[PDB]
Amino acid sequence: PSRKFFVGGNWMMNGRKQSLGELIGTLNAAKVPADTEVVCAPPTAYIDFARQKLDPKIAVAAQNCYKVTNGAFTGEISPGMIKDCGATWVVLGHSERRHVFGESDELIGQKVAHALAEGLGVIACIGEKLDEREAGITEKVVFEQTKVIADNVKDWSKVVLAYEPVWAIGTGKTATPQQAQEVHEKLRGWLKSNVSDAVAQSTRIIYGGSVTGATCKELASQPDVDGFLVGGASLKPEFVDIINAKQ
């Protein structure tokens, strides 16, 4: 069975009810291809709102969660709350969480374990910074990040891996499609060697670097790129073009 093309739209910390309402209206109107899995991740205040307005064909993801079901953790939400709001995914280990808010691999691992235990799907994010790539340790970094995730996964059917080329985000650097493919191929090889062949074959590995309507078709044609985690462009009509990257 082919890996189903997966496109996640991460709205990050953007939007209000009115503007997200318009965004959602555009997405509902768009004809999503068969065999294409679309997921939108609203700001945490709008998970409930977004699920109510979005067509059921589009799934909703939380942008983060914590590692227990309830507790004295002012400012956090649990997988239980996310599910209760009708969302079915959570983004974990996103570059912004790791590098702005200092979330450790250990913590991310604990979050993955809990989210999966609770019945959520997980979009698990990995990626190396510019100083890490320039030091020639891309492989070591993303393998270690993936290992911690893998150590906390008991069912990969609910997991999507997202590779973020952080070295090519906000640094002025650009990644070619071959550079994306190179990392994706290594990651799938890691899954094959450390988890199983079945998991390597079936697990979506999506690209989280710069992608546009003009570049998405070429990136999507790379053998080991299974879709995208889209940031800024997920807020624009351009997102529809990216959903249709296989058409």
The site partner of 14 among Na ion, K ion, its own copies, none (C-beta below 5 to 8 Å per kind) is its own copies
Integer Cα distance of 161 and 130 in angstroms: 20
Q: Which residue reads 């003009």 in tokens?
A: 214
Paired with 123 in beta bridges are 91, 160
Shortest distance, CB of residue 29 to Na ion, whole angstroms?
12
| Cβ(224)–Cβ(181) below 8 Å | yes
Shortest distance, CB of residue 176 to its own copies, whole angstroms?
22
The footprint of its own copies (CB under 8 A) covers 10, 12-17, 41, 43-49, 62-64, 66, 68, 70-78, 80-82, 84-85, 91, 94, 96-97, 100-102, 231-232
Which H or E run contains 206? strand 205-207
Shortest distance, CB of residue 221 to K ion, whole angstroms?
6
Question: Considering only residues 57, 119, 151, 221, which one is a binding residue for Na ion as defined by CB under 5 A?
Answer: 57
Q: Which residues contact 24 (CB under 8 A, 6 or more apart)?
A: 50, 53, 54
Set 96, 114, 164, 184: catalytic member: 164
Set 94, 96, 114, 128: catalytic member: 94
The answer to whether residue 151 forms part of the interface with Na ion (CB under 5 A) is: no
Give buried/exposed letters for 100-113 (b at 16+ CB in 10 A, else e): eeebebebbbbbbb
Greatest alpha-carbon pair distance for the chain in Å reads 48
User: Is 164 annotated as catalytic?
Assistant: yes
CB of 55 or CB of 131, closer to Na ion: 55
Q: Which residues bind K ion (CB under 5 A)?
A: 225
